[model samples]
Target: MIIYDTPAGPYPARVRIALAEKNMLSSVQFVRINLWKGEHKKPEFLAKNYSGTVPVLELDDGTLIAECTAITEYIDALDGTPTLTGKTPLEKGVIHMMNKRAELELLDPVSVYFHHATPGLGPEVELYQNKEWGLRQRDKALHGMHYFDTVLRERPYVAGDSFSMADITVIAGLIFAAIVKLQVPEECEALRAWYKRMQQRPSVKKLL
Candidate 1:
């Protein structure tokens, strides 16, 4: 299998961390896509993943899997152990809910701001201008920080006791946040401390 991806940064961290957690890092090959050069948007790459949101999985049979969630599911199902995503009914529900929240509140907003406000990928991908929306996303992303902090204060991990897909989703977002140079707000104490623990985890610690 081939995992088409940027070498680092963005939610692609979701798949990398997932692979490391499942001990599947050595199972697939990585094909680097240069986001700085607009390689992701080219028709050649788009042919494989129309969304162009990568870390796309190209299976041995030529089947392509895009999106972090979808690719993570494929990896998790590989051994039928179901580690990243939870196995039980309620666990699945909450994990997905929190995962979705991470996207809606933190990851996507920070990504939006990075694309709009910052000099993202230089002129090659600086194809739009919408600082109005972009600056708003800046504040919105911080709001997400507070909300996640509250969640962390109550639970050991994003979904509950054990780390799951939801935790990885937040991990992806926070990594995105760092790339955008968006630090977690000082008041988000729990989130900051949880992030510290996440960075120390065997899977996350090794890759980064």
Candidate 2:
């Protein structure tokens, strides 16, 4: 398999971290797509992903899988353990819900703030931007921080007892937040502590 992405990018970080956790980093090759140079928007790259996003997985047979959640599900199930995605139906449902919650409330808002409020990917790629919308999403991401802080106080992980795709989504959100200088609220002690612990994990550690 082949992976196309930019190293250190939040979306790619999640996928890379997943590979690390699965010990599958050696299973695929990485092809960097220069986001700063508007490489991803080019026609050749767009052919691989109509959405023109990074972190796309292309299999040996030329099967393309986009989206971090979907890519992660594929990786998690590859070994038959399904560790990150969960094995039981109940686990799958909860993990999916929390993963979606993390993406909607935290990750995507940070992305919008970066792309609109800040000079993201330079003016070449960010042809359209709305500062007002970006500012609104900034506030939403802060609120998301508080909410996740609240959630962390009740459980060891974002979804439940163990780390899952949900935690990876939240991790990516915080990573993007830092890139945009969106400091996590000081009052969010639980969330902050949880992040500190997560950073210590070998899977997440290598990504940083």
TM-score of each: 0.97, 0.99
Model 2 lDDT per residue over 137-171, tens place? 99999999999999999999999999999999999
Best by lDDT: 2
Clashing pairs in 2: none
Candidates' lDDT values, in order? 0.88, 0.94
- Candidate 1 clashes: the total is 0
Among all candidates shown, the one with the greatest TM-score: 2
- Give the per-residue lDDT of model 1 (tens digit) for 1-208: 8999986766788898999999888988999898878888999999998887788999999999999989988899889889878799988888889999998999899988888888877766878868899899989999999999999999999999999988998998898889888989888999999999999988899867
Candidate 1: which pairs clash? none
lDDT of 2: 0.94
Poorest stretch of ten by lDDT in candidate 1: 120-129
